[PDB]
Design a protein around this nucleic acid. Structure first.
Lengths: 78, 149, 125, 60, 108, 95
RNA sequence: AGGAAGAC
RNA sequence: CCAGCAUUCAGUUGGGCACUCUAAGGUGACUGCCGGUGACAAACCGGAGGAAGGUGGGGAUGACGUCAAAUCAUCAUGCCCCUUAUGACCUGGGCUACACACGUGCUACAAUGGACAGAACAAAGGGCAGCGAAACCGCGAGGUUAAGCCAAUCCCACAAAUCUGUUCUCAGUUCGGAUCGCAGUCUGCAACUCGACUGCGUGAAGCUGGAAUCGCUAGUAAUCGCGGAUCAGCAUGCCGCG
């Protein structure tokens, strides 16, 4: 994803789009750290696999260019 | 073991001025030669008509005034690490004289290379020199501790 | 049209000297902007002056390979071969004067486990 | 467990970047030579045996 | 002087303009090439009209405090986003990813 | 027509060189001498040990070399004769 | 005939 | 290879191997001669055609054994658990964390320099699910259609240190380049955890380093580059070359 746009997991892309076009629903279960946050995903709740659990995160408006991955750091220090 | 030396000749045996031939074509190598030697030649010219005589004999007495006659080594005897003065072979004399010349010329620190090299050449030309004073330091240690033989 | 070969430090040169008026030229470019590093100037001026054959022969020099000082040594060996080819009557005088050594000083083969084929890396207890 | 990953080696993988190199005469990754597909151990043993006719002791 | 802060006096302009914040050597070269000052100029000798037009072109470029407040705004935006990299700036650890055990000594 | 041959064993390639020169000369094919072409080199470095002692290594040389011959005149019957002529299994002929 | 220097 | 020739900015070409060059057979250096020592022996020193005189330089070559040294990570009787699982499939993470201490290296602290401009000298390897020239676009890594090469032809291959001009004039500086934000290029399904590279801006510590300590004898140290290997991509690591 450097010149031709964000590269994502299209199955749950269309799943969350068919979610939000109808209603607001519960957290989105995902193992995938792969995805970039598209700008139309504002206000959703994502459960990201941290390696041991699925942490909940709310999506704010400021999710400009960075991917989904930084919401769940995989290391605990002190 | 045993020492051994080799033979090699750079210059011509006849019709060869030693210091002039050395000055034009000998023993400074590995780059930064050309501009440094031209500005070094005109440093020789500015000290040539800075002194009131020929400058080669004051360069050679500068070499004498940097040129050491004795130095002292350290030998292990007793519990004091005593010092023994020694008479010196002429190639070692030449190596020491040029070595102190170049390293104190690069070591004192000045504006740039040609004027500093001329600065310690003139500083060796007069007797009140820094590395000259180090040569007399080597003597005053040597004839301070030459009661050891 | 006497022809000589010279090799020094991974470089070769060939020399052709014929009777001229004493002209000296390498690669058909001249002394000023073709020849830096005045060790090359004493190279090109030493043997013709020590011999009495200076102003008689003109020399064209062709060059292949190598660097500057090794190239100068190749010039040395080429012109030494050219003179021993041309005028052998004082070739023995040139022999015990020297300059016919053709030194075998070439780059050392790098040894495995060493840095520069002499330098072990570093040591500690 | 080695022949599980040997089965990964002969089987085509899911994506083409996931494919890697194994020498497959002896059983290891990690310093396979590409143009022989032999690693150091089984290469030098079978080279002292004398196959791969280009190869001999090296000195210059 | 130019951006409200002083200038060195006895050096060339293509170097002296690099002293003020947020502008640099290559940028100063490319602005003074079209400015036409021949890249060797003391500030003791210049004209007021060329001073005014370099004043407005460095006025249009992002020089004085705006780069500072811009990078501050992005980094505080990263703090209330959180998202790991802001935690790295808050802790002082290196960010672009390195061996954090061996050197890590420009920071902290 | 130019014929190349490239292999490891310069002995048997040399007797192949005079054997092809002998066949072409007895056919009268406007013969040219075999020109020695420069070799190509590949030196590989192997860990001497199995698990340890990285400073212990060994080197293995691979050297392969080529030679070229040229026939000026066409002479197609003798050219087909030297096509149908048998060759050893190391001479590695290329047309 | 030319230094004091412990333990595993 | 362009010597000896005619030809053109591409000296490509028409013609030819004497040279470097690639390489088979060799020629060659072996104590082969003189003197002096050495009981006249073996050897040592100084001399001569010589490219090298006393194993010419280097590599490969590593005896009986020692350290119960290292490896059950290629293979293999010896026991242990399983075979409705310490054996299996995949997704994500970790091997790259970080108050610290150490080993090995790189880049410097500079005017025996930095920056910019011009003239340079060209070793050894790799190339067809490739090497990729010219030209165009691009403030850049790169993109475009793409001539040539299964290679002493084509590409990597534009070698830097080197040599002449201007500047800086001794400063945390025009040194030094690390961290940081913005915007990108390439590879790959995917560069956050965790790739490389570029344009910017930011500019840090550092002004040659105590106790101690390391390498180095006929291109050796030191510097300057250049390739190559694993590999889609990633060098300061390693191997090799000048």
């Amino acid at each position: 994803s450097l010149k031709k746009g964000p590269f994502v997991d299209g199955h749950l892309m269309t799943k969350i789009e068919k979610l939000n076009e109808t209603d607001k629903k519960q957290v989105v279960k995902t193992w995938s750290r792969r995805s970039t946050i598209f700008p139309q995903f504002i206000g959703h709740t994502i459960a990201v696999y941290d390696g041991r659990k699925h942490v909940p995160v709310f999506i704010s408006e400021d999710m400009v260019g960075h991917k989904l991955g930084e919401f769940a750091p995989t290391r605990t220090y002190k | 073991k045993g020492p051994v030396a080799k033979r090699d000749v750079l210059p011509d045996p006849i019709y060869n001025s030693k210091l002039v031939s050395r000055l034009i074509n000998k023993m400074m190598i590995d780059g930064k030669k050309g501009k440094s030697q031209t500005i070094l030649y005109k440093s020789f010219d500015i000290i040539k008509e800075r002194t009131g005589n020929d400058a080669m004999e004051v360069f050679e007495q500068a070499l004498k005034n940097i040129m050491p006659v004795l130095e002292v080594k350290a030998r292990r005897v007793g519990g004091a690490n005593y010092q023994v003065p020694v008479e010196v072979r002429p190639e070692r004399r030449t190596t020491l004289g040029l070595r102190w010349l170049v390293n104190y010329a690069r070591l004192r620190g000045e504006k740039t290379m040609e004027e500093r090299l001329a600065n310690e050449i003139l500083d060796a030309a007069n007797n009140t020199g820094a590395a000259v004073k180090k040569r007399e330091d080597t003597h005053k240690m040597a004839e301070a501790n030459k009661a050891f033989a | 049209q006497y022809y000589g070969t010279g090799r020094r430090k991974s470089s070769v040169a060939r020399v052709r000297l014929v009777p001229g008026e004493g002209r000296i030229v390498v690669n058909n470019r001249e002394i000023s902007e073709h020849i830096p590093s005045a060790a090359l100037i004493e190279d090109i001026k030493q043997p013709l002056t020590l011999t009495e054959t200076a102003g008689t022969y003109d020399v064209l020099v062709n060059v292949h390979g190598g660097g500057l000082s090794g190239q100068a040594g190749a010039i040395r060996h080429g012109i030494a071969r050219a003179l021993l080819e041309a005028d052998p009557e004082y070739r023995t005088t040139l022999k015990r004067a020297g300059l016919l050594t053709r030194d075998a000083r070439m780059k050392e083969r790098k040894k495995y486990g060493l840095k520069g084929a002499r330098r072990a890396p570093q040591f500690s207890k | 467990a080695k022949k599980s990953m040997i089965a990964k080696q002969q089987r085509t993988p899911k994506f083409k970047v996931q494919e890697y190199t194994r020498c497959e005469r002896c059983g290891r990754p990690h310093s396979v030579i590409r143009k022989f597909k032999l690693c150091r151990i089984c290469f030098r043993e079978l080279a002292y045996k004398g196959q791969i006719p280009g190869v001999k002791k090296a000195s210059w | 002087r130019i951006a409200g802060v002083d200038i060195p006096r006895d050096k060339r302009v293509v170097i002296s303009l690099t002293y003020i914040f947020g502008i640099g050597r290559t940028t100063a070269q490319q602005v003074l090439k079209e400015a036409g000052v021949s890249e060797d100029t003391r500030v003791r000798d210049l004209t007021e009209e060329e001073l005014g037009k370099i004043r407005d072109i460095i006025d249009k470029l992002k020089v004085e405090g705006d780069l500072r407040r811009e990078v501050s705004l992005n980094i505080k935006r990263l703090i209330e986003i959180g998202s790991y990299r802001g935690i790295r700036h808050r802790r002082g650890l290196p960010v672009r990813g390195q061996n954090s055990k061996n050197n890590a000594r420009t920071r902290k | 027509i130019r014929i190349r041959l490239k292999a490891y064993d310069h002995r048997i390639l040399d007797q192949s060189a005079e054997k092809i020169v002998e066949t072409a000369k007895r056919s009268g094919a406007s013969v040219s001498g075999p020109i020695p072409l420069p070799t190509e080199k590949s030196v590989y470095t192997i860990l001497r040990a199995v698990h340890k002692y990285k400073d212990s290594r060994e080197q293995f040389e691979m050297r392969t070399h080529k030679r070229l011959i040229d026939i000026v005149n066409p002479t197609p019957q003798t050219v087909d004769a030297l096509m149908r002529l048998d060759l050893p299994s190391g001479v590695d002929i290329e047309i």
